[PDB]
Amino acid sequence: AAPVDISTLPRVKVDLVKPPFVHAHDQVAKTGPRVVEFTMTIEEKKLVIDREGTEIHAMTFNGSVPGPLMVVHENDYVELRLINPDTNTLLHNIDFHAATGALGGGALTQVNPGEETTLRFKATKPGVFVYHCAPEGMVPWHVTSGMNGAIMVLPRDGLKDEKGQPLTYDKIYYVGEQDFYVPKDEAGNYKKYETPGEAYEDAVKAMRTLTPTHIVFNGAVGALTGDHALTAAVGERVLVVHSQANRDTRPHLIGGHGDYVWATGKFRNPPDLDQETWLIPGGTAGAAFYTFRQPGVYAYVNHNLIEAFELGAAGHFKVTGEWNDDLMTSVVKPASM
Amino acid sequence: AAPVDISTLPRVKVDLVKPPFVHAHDQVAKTGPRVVEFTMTIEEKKLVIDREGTEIHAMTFNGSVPGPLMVVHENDYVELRLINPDTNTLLHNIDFHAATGALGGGALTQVNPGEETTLRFKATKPGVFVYHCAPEGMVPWHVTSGMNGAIMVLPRDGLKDEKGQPLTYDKIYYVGEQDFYVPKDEAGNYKKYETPGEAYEDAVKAMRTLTPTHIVFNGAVGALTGDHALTAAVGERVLVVHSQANRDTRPHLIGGHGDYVWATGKFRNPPDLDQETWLIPGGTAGAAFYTFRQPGVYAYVNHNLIEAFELGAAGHFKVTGEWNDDLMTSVVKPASM
Amino acid sequence: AAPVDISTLPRVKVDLVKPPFVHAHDQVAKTGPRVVEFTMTIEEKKLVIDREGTEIHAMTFNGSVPGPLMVVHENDYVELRLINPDTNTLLHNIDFHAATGALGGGALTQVNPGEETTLRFKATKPGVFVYHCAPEGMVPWHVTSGMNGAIMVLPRDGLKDEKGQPLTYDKIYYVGEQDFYVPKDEAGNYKKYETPGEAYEDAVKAMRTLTPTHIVFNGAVGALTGDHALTAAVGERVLVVHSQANRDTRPHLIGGHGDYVWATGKFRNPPDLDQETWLIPGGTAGAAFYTFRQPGVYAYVNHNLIEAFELGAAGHFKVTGEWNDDLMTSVVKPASM
Numbered sequence A, B, C: 001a002a003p004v005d006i007s008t009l010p011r012v013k014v015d016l017v018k019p020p021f022v023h024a025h026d027q028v029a030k031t032g033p034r035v036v037e038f039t040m041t042i043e044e045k046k047l048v049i050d051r052e053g054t055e056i057h058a059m060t061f062n063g064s065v066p067g068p069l070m071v072v073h074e075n076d077y078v079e080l081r082l083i084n085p086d087t088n089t090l091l092h093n094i095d096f097h098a099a100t101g102a103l104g105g106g107a108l109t110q111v112n113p114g115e116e117t118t119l120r121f122k123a124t125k126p127g128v129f130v131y132h133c134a135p136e137g138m139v140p141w142h143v144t145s146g147m148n149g150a151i152m153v154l155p156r157d158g159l160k161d162e163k164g165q166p167l168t169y170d171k172i173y174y175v176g177e178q179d180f181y182v183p184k185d186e187a188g189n190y191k192k193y194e195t196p197g198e199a200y201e202d203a204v205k206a207m208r209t210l211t212p213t214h215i216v217f218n219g220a221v222g223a224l225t226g227d228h229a230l231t232a233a234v235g236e237r238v239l240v241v242h243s244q245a246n247r248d249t250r251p252h253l254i255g256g257h258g259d260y261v262w263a264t265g266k267f268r269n270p271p272d273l274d275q276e277t278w279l280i281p282g283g284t285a286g287a288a289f290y291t292f293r294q295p296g297v298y299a300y301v302n303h304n305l306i307e308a309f310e311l312g313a314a315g316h317f318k319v320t321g322e323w324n325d326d327l328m329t330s331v332v333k334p335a336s337m
């Protein structure tokens, strides 16, 4: 039996958006299988990651930490043009956990500054998956410099609950959680470096402590707060895709739940119901579906609360609508007696 | 459609017990939905947490670390009177992971010393859940000072196995596992502090190491041993609820199993069978059901064995009854030859 | 009702093999229940664990880290003769997480140098399980010196998928992952020690940091690479059993998946499908089944990539067969433009 002639399939070009937003897509596939075309441009850039002003040299897909969320359906082909402009200094590549073969693509996509490449793979398994740079011999340095994102491979008939009934989200957000290892001197202050090569050994030393200096959502402390808080309305169904390319996390919606959670991200499995908190292992993307029931502020965190509130792994939702006093009320407001 | 008039519902007052014991309750609900009334009094107090005599300033619900286990059924209302006496010095509140809205209750329950408040919420999801103090801006300090416990929301028809058959426990225990971060000087000795404000920065520094100094059950090294070992008889069905409000744990019954385990604690999901060890993520309560088959001593641990046997995360069961040589026997006792 | 007379049952002697290989066995039981006889000889020995030449004093079952994989079926009896030769210096024992009673066997198997013992237990629960030494008062020291392995208790009708259909592996490998805590001086160099007693306090100090110095597969950095890479052919079904007796891990096949994964190792549960990465809690064995679809090199890692590529937790597969360009292809090889 001969393979399909891939040139006979539809091609659709996706235009990516910056996290936590997600490029519009259809949950249930409205066409047959397609070759879904993506382009990303690698950008090495300085980023300020905390309120103190700590500035690092980040390594990004498309200018953001995390890289953007890509969305396809099961048995589509993903065709990525990966560009490493000559304004960068390092070698990069890309590994898709969604893909099969060649170290997820990394063995086929090594691009020096001034080079580009195009990789195609068939997205044979539904789920959310990490993608990340992984140059042989310097893999964790690139990943923990921010060079990771995620791809969602939807079932062609959309998401389903534990009984096989549909689950349809109204909104989707992508939270990439990044552990950074900013090198410290003996007194505990961050060091700064003149070139990437001069940074490398202390970057390795800092990583080998296994103790992040910062753990952030969307690339910085506070990034998903204030004017950039996530939003929803009461009654809205929201999917939050959450990735961590290098270290475990334990997401939690403060004031809510994960009504349906694929903690390790793979949609052929029935979701776990009614979660308070769930474990997304390092190297994984997970997804949680929730229908909001109360308005107000929520905090969405890694529930190692030190990691959340001291190291950065906390964002907010601002939710609009009516308050339900049956679900919760202050019977007696705080008072002296 | 109008809401139910909650004043028409039965009220029942619960009288809490100190962990690891659990206030008597009925597994299968013997009434319709009720407003279940609880009272807890916050107590800041010194606690000796290890064999060396290390003394910390703990922040407790009801005088214990962990706070007591509360038990209700799905779609009961929990009505908690939370009292912060004027003998305390700090601001406190309470967040229930079982609840929906207002940061689990924390936004509605801020009490200064000399204040009290009453919160009501509907327990809409079955499972075991963490509760903890969470004052904005100093959340992990309160949690990791011991200010956390758990609530069990039973299905109205009790627990069920993976096939839908009942599971009925004979005994229940609540193991709260606490990570403490006692500040250390450069030589490695614990520091002591004159006031909570003078402690705060080094408490933050110590937490940011992400390395607990102590990890204990029921508030101290050895608390669940000796005259306070857990007990059972051969053939008894025991549910062990285990919470960790801030850091992952991996419980294990040495010499036994978790016959049915809800590792992330939520009873609408079928349990995992025959577990040796299970991962309870930080910010979660889990529950394990076991039928004892052999007498003797067991050790119940976090199976990072350093955490268990060096840092404190180990308790014991003393089990009474007949020894089964079919299940295990010494064929040849240790000997020279 | 009287117990079975165990002397009426067949006895079969197993001859163990060194990891990552596994002693031949039948997936589906070809006999009724048997007493399966194993012998292991404890060996304390020096091991070089990294490329730098760091040499530790390891504590082994049968000369290897990990100890060999034992394989039986559900409701067989395991009868282990455990020998501690007089050439060793320490007390040892064995705890099987598969067993019920007497701290998994440890209370019955304490052997001084020059002693042996024989333990029997009934393997009543199917799954992969850790076994490890656990001498009272010095448990984590022995475990983290390498004194751990695993046992697989197969269902009598072999493995099944989430729908109850058979899963049959063609190849099985056992990856034991070991966290070592080599004591460091203040400058960060490893210390060496003249006797085990002189090592003990700093071993304890090093363990209490909770920061491994090395995390390795099969006892050393690079052990499962080069001439000792794992092998498969395209189309082959491979089961990888993975244990970690003391600390969480998150395995990942780089370029592949876990098609069916029992992350916490217990076969009465349906497997998780299509995993990218899975969490094996410390104190647990897990198992992943994969059918290879592409040839070439794969890296099998703990996907804390620092742990993998800096601390040692990485091995390789070399896979033989045809490349499938439908599944993945380089459309445009890296080039300037």
Ligand SMILES: O=N[O-]
Pocket: A252, A253, A254, A255, B095, B096, B097, B103, B104, B134
């Ligand atoms: O109650 N959430 O931190």
Ligand SMILES: O=N[O-]
Pocket: B252, B253, B254, B255, C095, C096, C097, C103, C104, C134
């Ligand atoms: O065998 N339990 O540590």
Ligand SMILES: O=N[O-]
Pocket: A095, A096, A097, A103, A104, A134, C252, C253, C254, C255
């Ligand atoms: O893409 N695996 O590191």
Ligand SMILES: [Cu+2]
Pocket: A059, A091, A092, A093, A133, A134, A135, A142, A147
């Ligand atoms: Cu890169």
Ligand SMILES: [Cu+2]
Pocket: A095, A097, A130, A132, A283, C252, C254, C303
């Ligand atoms: Cu990866």
Ligand SMILES: [Cu+2]
Pocket: B059, B091, B092, B093, B133, B134, B135, B142, B147
């Ligand atoms: Cu408090």
Ligand SMILES: [Cu+2]
Pocket: A252, A254, A303, B095, B097, B130, B132, B283
């Ligand atoms: Cu919380």
Ligand SMILES: [Cu+2]
Pocket: C059, C091, C092, C093, C133, C134, C135, C142, C147
């Ligand atoms: Cu030993």
Ligand SMILES: [Cu+2]
Pocket: B252, B254, B303, C095, C097, C130, C132, C283
């Ligand atoms: Cu153990």
